[PDB]
């Protein structure tokens, strides 16, 4: 019973464990606290593998093998699931919240929308189970997560290449982080919040002076106004770079 009680405790814990979810503004179900159940699964797997060392392992070998298989499947599910959520959450900050960036990247936006719909369907299917161990019984759950993580990583690589090309277009952008560069790029129709990054990419220049749709000049960090010779005309379709 010194082993029976440990196996019963493992089963009892896994018959009640369930991930905590918080609703997202896009309708997705985000999971909080990935660490607790992952650590519990890993520790239970270590306990199961150390159980085989005891010579009393034969009596409960069948149950130990069933639990070992179930927990290995759950670990393989969790490892992909956490990072799928991480990549989707990172990419949603870039795409899906700004129309201009979506216009710049139509293929990436379409693929991201399809991935979001598929992941939403999978998560809605999985969270009805009310238990985190029953998710392994969902058919092709792991393969769907692998496809989603691969597509999200490829989208992220495409986005990174696009940002590097954008920097190479205007080398001053290298002084701005990816977040700031995307804030500049997405500011298509506005083209007035770019001035907040002037002190970062242009050094002395603090902001820009816009008159109607013309750039009359810039001003330094000391408040000195510099007036351009020919005022630059801005349109809605003109790129920030």
């Amino acid at each position: 019973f010194v082993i029976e009680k440990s196996l019963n405790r493992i089963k009892k814990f896994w018959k009640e464990a369930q991930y905590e979810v918080i609703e997202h503004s896009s309708g997705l179900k985000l999971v909080r606290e990935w660490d607790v159940l992952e650590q519990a699964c890993k520790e239970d797997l270590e306990e199961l593998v150390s159980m085989k060392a005891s010579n009393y392992y034969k009596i409960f070998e069948q149950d130990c093998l069933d639990l070992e298989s179930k927990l290995t499947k759950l670990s393989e599910i969790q490892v992909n699931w956490v990072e799928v959520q991480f990549y989707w959450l990172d990419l949603y900050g870039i795409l899906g919240e700004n129309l201009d960036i979506q216009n710049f990247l139509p293929l990436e936006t379409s693929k991201f929308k399809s991935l979001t719909s598929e992941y939403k369907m999978i998560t809605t299917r999985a969270f009805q189970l009310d238990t985190t161990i029953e998710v392994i019984h969902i058919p092709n759950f792991d393969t769907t997560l692998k496809l989603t993580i691969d597509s999200l990583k490829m989208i992220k690589s495409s986005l990174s290449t696009f940002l590097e090309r954008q920097r190479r277009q205007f080398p001053r952008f290298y002084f701005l982080g990816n977040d700031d560069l995307l804030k500049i790029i997405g500011s298509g129709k506005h083209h007035d919040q770019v001035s907040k990054f002037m002190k970062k990419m242009f050094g002395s220049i603090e902001s820009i002076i816009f008159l109607e749709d013309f750039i009359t000049g810039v001003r330094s960090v000391e408040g000195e106004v510099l007036n351009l010779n020919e005022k630059i005309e801005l349109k809605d379709s003109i790129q920030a770079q």
Partner: protein, 562 residues
């Protein structure tokens, strides 16, 4: 024309006067030369500007000549930067940098901190019309950002300066040394494209890298061996403090500026030699420049005489000094200078302090009034203050009394948030991010900063805000508000958005030890030092008795109580 000009054009005239004083100094030196050979010698060292005429190219029609080497002038906007005074050491530094750049080498300055290496590099960049970008080292600074910045520098052809290149972890040090060596070899050889950040990027031939090395624990810090071949070191001697002070005083309009500068420099070096060495004692060039800058608000109150200088020295130097050094400071001030010791604009505020202290129960002794005056005059200039003493000095009594007195005097309400910086974790003080769902939590300091900035009630505009960090401060906690401490005065969160602090937002550190704070923090904040108990041993007994009596008065009859 300076005295009758608006502030924006006052800055421009003050920046021009530095160069015109340099012109006058050079012409005066050339006049006294007894030989044409000596005149040519002296004229060679001085940085001479020229404009080409046979070259149609407009942006490259102006070049700089010093010691026979020609450097082009890039017409980048530099604004109205704080111009450095043209000391002979500055001209030697310019000549060294020009000598290094003529061979497509690098430039390196080394020497004790405070000799003006970073500022010399920046001023050399300014004189050529470039904006030298500074790479602060070991300041929340990783290697990916260094790779990105170096790629940007190479591609745009700007000048880069590695301030404090001696302090940074060895791994990033080696990686950045490799990248810098690649850049320098690409410059010397002349190849169009170089391979850094695992990518082949174009290299502009106008790129340059400068490195400043502050002294290490052993002594003179040295470049890594690989970089030693592509860089030309240069020792930065002690700056000509007399010339700097003299020119600054002359620009400020002070009469007898030469004697005033000599007296200030002599007094500060006497303080350095006489006072007991403490880690928070800095009487270098930065302290002298702060004293000189602090004279400007005092000009209206006192004038442009020596008394303004003496009063500014008492405002800046004195409150940071210990008990044994206060008498040394007083003796040196009485010896070098001569002042009447009569402070102006210290009559109504003194009465407000007396009223507030009487209301709170404190006894206005000499020491307590002295410390309250030092706090009140310190808080006018510095946004952040550090009150240091021993347990029971009177720090919280001092700032509570002064805050109440200022509330009475100016009529401005005071909102005081007392925060124990060490009780709360950093994630609980500045807020934390959920790595699983990316939901930012405000925290404590950021929440009240938001409330102050987003003053929906409209009261924080007409009131002062104080946040007192009562617990002892440590470098890690103050590292998250170093941006607030800088002139930027914005709270740079790790993520989310940036919060700018209003002019009303004051930060106080009511600590008792300074054994861990970096010198940058204490030189960015007004340090007030308590070396002795503010009140006597009987004033405290009287105050405690009065407090107990007023506590009992709520439940006891008048006759019994009296």
């Amino acid at each position: 024309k300076l005295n009758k000009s608006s502030d924006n054009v006052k800055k421009k005239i003050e920046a021009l006067l530095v160069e015109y004083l340099h012109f006058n100094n050079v012409i005066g030196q050339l006049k006294n030369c007894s030989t044409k050979e000596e005149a040519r010698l002296l004229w060679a060292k001085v940085q001479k500007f020229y404009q080409k005429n046979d070259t149609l190219d407009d942006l490259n029609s102006v070049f700089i000549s010093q010691s026979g080497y020609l450097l082009q002038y890039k017409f980048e906007y530099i604004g109205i930067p704080e111009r450095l005074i043209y000391t002979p050491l500055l001209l030697i530094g310019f000549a060294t940098l020009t000598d290094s750049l003529h061979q497509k080498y690098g430039g390196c300055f080394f020497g004790p901190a405070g000799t003006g290496k970073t500022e010399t590099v920046k001023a050399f960049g300014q004189n050529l019309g470039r904006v030298v970008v500074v790479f602060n080292c070991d300041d929340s600074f990783d290697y990916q950002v260094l790779s990105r910045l170096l790629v940007g520098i190479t591609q745009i052809g700007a000048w880069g300066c590695f301030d404090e290149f001696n302090r940074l972890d060895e791994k990033v040090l080696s990686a950045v040394s490799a990248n810098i060596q690649q850049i320098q070899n690409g410059l010397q050889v002349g190849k169009s494209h170089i391979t850094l950040l695992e990518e082949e990027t174009p290299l502009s031939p106008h790129t340059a890298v400068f490195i400043t090395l502050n002294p290490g624990y052993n002594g003179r810090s040295e470049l890594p061996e690989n970089l030693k071949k592509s860089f030309r070191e240069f020792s930065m001697k002690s700056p000509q403090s007399g010339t700097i002070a003299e020119m600054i005083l002359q620009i400020m309009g002070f009469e007898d500026s030469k004697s005033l500068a000599s007296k200030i420099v002599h007094f500060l070096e006497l303080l350095s030699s006489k006072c007991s060495s403490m880690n928070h004692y800095h009487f270098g060039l930065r302290t002298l420049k702060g004293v000189l800058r602090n004279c400007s608000p005092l000009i209206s109150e006192f004038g442009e005489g020596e008394k303004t200088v003496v009063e500014s020295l008492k405002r800046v130097i004195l409150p940071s000094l210990g008990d044994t050094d206060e008498l040394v400071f007083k003796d040196e001030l009485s010896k070098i200078f001569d002042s009447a010791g009569t402070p102006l604009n210290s009559k109504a505020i003194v009465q407000c302090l007396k009223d507030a202290g009487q209301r709170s129960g404190f006894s206005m002794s000499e020491e307590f009034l002295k410390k309250c005056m030092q706090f009140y005059y310190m808080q006018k200039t510095q946004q952040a203050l550090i009150l240091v003493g021993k347990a029971g000095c009177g720090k919280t009594a001092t700032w509570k009394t002064v805050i109440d007195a200022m509330a009475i005097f100016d009529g401005h309400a005071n909102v005081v948030y007392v925060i124990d910086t060490k009780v709360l974790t950093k994630e609980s003080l500045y807020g934390s991010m959920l790595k699983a769902t990316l939901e930012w939590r405000d925290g404590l300091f950021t929440s009240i900063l938001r409330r102050v900035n987003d003053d929906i009630t409209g009261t924080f505009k007409n009131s002062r805000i104080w946040v007192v960090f009562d617990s002892d401060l440590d470098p890690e906690y103050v590292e998250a508000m170093n941006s607030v401490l800088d002139d930027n005065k914005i709270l740079t969160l790790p993520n989310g958005e940036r919060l700018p602090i209003p002019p009303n937002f004051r930060i106080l550190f009511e600590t008792d030890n300074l054994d861990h704070t970096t010198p940058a923090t204490i030189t960015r904040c007004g340090l007030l030092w308590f070396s002795t108990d503010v009140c006597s041993i009987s004033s405290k007994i009287d105050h405690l008795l009065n407090k107990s009596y007023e506590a009992l008065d709520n439940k006891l009859s008048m006759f019994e109580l009296d």
